[PDB]
Each structure stands twice: as C-alpha cells, then as structure tokens.
Amino acid sequence: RGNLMGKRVDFSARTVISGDPNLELDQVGVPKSIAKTLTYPEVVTPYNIDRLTQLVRNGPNEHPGAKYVIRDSGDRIDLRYSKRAGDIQLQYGWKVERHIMDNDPVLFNRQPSLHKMSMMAHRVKVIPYSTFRLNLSVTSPYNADFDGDEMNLHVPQSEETRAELSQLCAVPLQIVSPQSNKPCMGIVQDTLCGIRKLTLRDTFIELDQVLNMLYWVPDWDGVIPTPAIIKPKPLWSGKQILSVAIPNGIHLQRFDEGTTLLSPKDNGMLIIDGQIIFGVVEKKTVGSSNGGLIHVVTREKGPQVCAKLFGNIQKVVNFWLLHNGFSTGIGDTIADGPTMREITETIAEAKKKVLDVTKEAQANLLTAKHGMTLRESFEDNVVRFLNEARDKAGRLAEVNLKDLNNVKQMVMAGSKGSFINIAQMSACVGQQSVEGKRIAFGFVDRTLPHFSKDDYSPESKGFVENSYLRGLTPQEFFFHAMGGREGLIDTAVKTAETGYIQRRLVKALEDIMVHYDNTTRNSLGNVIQFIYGEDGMDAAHIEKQSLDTIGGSDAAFEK
C-alpha cells in the first residue's frame, strides 16, 4: 500500500495558495524559487539550441536557467559547480535540464483527491512571490480555499507525458464533468456579485469607464458599441459592456417564474449572437449549472473559448466592481422596529401554542395515531411549532430587508448566503437538536440545574428566541454549543468512514474499462455492461432535455 501503489516522487512541489483575478483559468502561478528548482529534460534540437545555450549560460541561480547538462556519455555536468559552466558548447542529442518556464504543462493537485478534477493540468506562469496563484473559478473542483490551504505540483519529464497532461488532463477539458453531467466550474464570489450589480437596468456606464472596460477584454474587436442611450447623454448599460465578453454566435434562452417576453422584473435570460437582450445575470446564468453560459459555450465554441470566457468576464466585472465598491456591516442584519415586534409576537404565539398543546397532553385528552407514542406525538408537534416559528420570523425579516441590503444582494446574486443565515442573524436562530431530539435531561429531570424538574418548555429544551444580533442567553449559549459539538464530531469522524467507503469503491471498480467493442468489462474479461450506461454515451456530452410526446393531454398532442 505504501511503497508500490503510492510512493514519494521527484520533481514535486507544494505551497500555500492564494487567488489571482488577473491569472487565466488554465494557468497556475509558480514562485520563482520553485521554478529554479524543478527541471524539465529537453533534448537539444536545431529548433531549441539557441534558446537552450542561453539558458545554460544564464545559469541555475537565475531563471530562465538550467541546472544540469547531460552528454551523450551519460555524465552530468553540474552548472552550479563546474569550471566549464561558461564555455559549454551544446552538441545535438545532449539533454539540458531547463528551469520550468511559462506555458509548461504541470499537474496541480489538492490531497483530498476525490475527483479526477482534483488533479488537473495547468499552464505554468512564473510569479514573484512565495504562494501558488490560481484562478478563482478553479477553486470549486479542488474544493480549494485560501484560508491556509496547501496545494501540490508535479512536472512531466517526457514529451509523451506532457502531451498526456495537455490533451487529457487540461483544465479547459475538465470543465464539463462526467459526474452530474454538468459543468463543475463557474463564476464565483466578487465576480458573481458584481455581475448581478452590473446587469441591473439601473446600471449605466459613462464613456470613460466604457472605454476602459472595452480595452480590458483581451480579445476586444475595437468596435466601440453604440450606446443604448444616445441623445440626453451617451449612456451604456452594463449588459452592453458585458456582451463584449460573450462570443458572437451564443444563444441562451431561459424563462423564470413569471417571465414575459417583456421581462418586467428583469428575470430570466435571453442572449442572441453573444448580446444579452434582457434579464439580470446571476448564478443561474453563469454558474456551474446545466444550461448555463459555461455549458453552452463549451459545447458550441469549444473548451478553449470557454476557458478564455472565464477570464474575460472576470476582468470586466472585477474592474467595474472595484470602481463601484461593495461592503457589509451590522446594518445589514438590523430589521425594522415594527418587523422586530412582529417577530417577537410570532415567537410568543408559538410559545402559546406549545403551552396549550402541553396542557392538553397533561390532561390525557391527547390521542396518538397508530404506531406513535403519545409523548412522540407531543414531541413532533412541539418541534414543528417551533420550526415553523423560526421560518416565519426569518421570512418576515427577509421581506423587511431592502434591495440595498448587502446580505440580500449576495443572496440574490448567489455568491454567498442563504435564507437560514438571514433568519438566524436577524430574527432568531431557533431550536437546537442533539441526536435528532431536543436537548435532554443530562441532569435528573432537568436540562440544567437552573431549571425546575420535569420542565418541557421550549427554552428548557433548547429553543433560542434570540437572534445572533440580540445575543444568546447563558442557557441558550450552552445548548447551542451542545448542538455544534455534534457537527464537529460529525466532520472529524465522518471523514474516515467516507474515505474507507471511497477506497473500497475504487478498488472494487478499478479495472472497469470500456473496450473497443463498446462493452464494459473487468480485468478477467467478464462483461459488466454490454454498453456503457446502456446508451453508449460519455457522461460529459449529456444534458437534461424534455421529451415532448410524453406529457400533456391527448388534445394538445393532436394539435
């Protein structure tokens, strides 16, 4: 297991990673110190010799350089310590161990390697700092974060291996993932929030900013788009400028909820010939989702064009957002005074409902359905009451939040946040649960020594009427800590069991390959499937489409 299936390897590197908005999706930022350490063996040809000699003259101490020269005899000339490091006269067929240079195939990896996406080929770009740099839209396949994560880099040593990395493992190829038959990369974080802000009909751009954004797109045609508004002042829309990033010939049609062809609320999406007709751009349009811009552009234009689309969109949106600004404060968690009154009244009515159900149960007037304890019925009813209370208070809060509220902005764009976050921060965090039940009596008939015995009230069993803004009480805080400990245990313990499961799954199906007769066989030749997936289709080239004959009435079918 430890020396044959896996082993430590040469020509490897590893370091902390941060992200770079100005790096390309398939590119990786490699520190100079790493570049001067890792070498590629390059055989001198008439094509490369004039460069190679220079590198060997440039020396191993400064990049682009080289560290070793291998003669025909197999002797290695060390350029660090050699009296002949100066007068080297390269002969054809010799090998030069050149420094790793820009646009060189490497394999980039993050060690929880659950995906083939976890190891992807990248184009080297050498950088002046100690961290690995990578594009934001490539974080998702690696599950990468910049809170301190370290990533690893491997260097091919033969041209065949470089071809394998560039023709199979390249990042643009892996855009459409075979699992889930959808793209795995998309527009995230600042780019996504800014793209929603930019696509708004209210967003208008002046001539100077328009020109700078147009130049910012690397493949700009130089044709300044005709401004949407002309006479009172030449005003472009954000959609117009962003349409420059969209390649010509791209058509995207999506209808959302109540979307007319007049799109009154700017919902939905219509794009014709790489120009957006209506709608606000958000996670649906430009995320990893099926039928998004990434899937459509990869299928129609090709993986390379989509990979460049990532960078073009990022440049435009990041520039506009930098000059627009975005922020979040405690003011984004405050709810109106009347809204807070209504939230507390919702909590109080839920408390009254719980109390009345309890008084009913104590009177033995409750009747439990078949297969359920009377106490089980009581528990289910109280839990449902309190969960409904939390959800209703949170919805009150979210309706109260204005469009300028930045948490609501991030949720609308889809860059971060959820409804439950708004509810817990602004209205109340609700009921805490351990092992599927409310907090129990660790003490005799009491959850805490501060309560009376045989107390079943919501606050006694771990209901937090307080939002994170209001602040948890002592008992609420202890109950919440009890709840969170369970999640910490689940992380630290689940990981091992899921890893064991994945190892067994991989060892069970490792030999399963599609042979040249379209069958799916194991090492011994036994047929697992006579055709892969029973349709013979690679999972990446597959999208959900509707079968129009199956649905509807017979009359509509006839028509």
């Binding site: 003490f443 805490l448 009890m482 400990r485 910490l488």
Partner: protein
C-alpha cells in the same frame, strides 16, 4: 500556556458530546478539532 495547564483527556456511551453536567466545569467551546474532539477538554 495557561490553556495547556488547564487541560484534561478522556482515554478511549457518548464521550465526545458536550454533556449537561459539563456546565460550569468544562469549557463548552474549547476542544480540539480532529480525532481528539470532545475527548480532550479544557477546564
């Protein structure tokens, strides 16, 4: 330093979870993340 001095260990039916009787005796928040989660406690 203080924290390393105020530290316990439980060598091994639900030891890891924060028990009710831990109130006021063991810190509810301070625990290692990883294999020693819940088993290692701080006073």
């Amino acid at each position: 330093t203080l924290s390393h001095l105020r530290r316990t260990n439980t060598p091994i039916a639900k030891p890891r979870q924060l028990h009710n009787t831990h109130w006021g005796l063991v810190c509810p928040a301070e625990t290692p993340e990883g294999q020693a989660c819940g088993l290692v406690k701080n006073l």
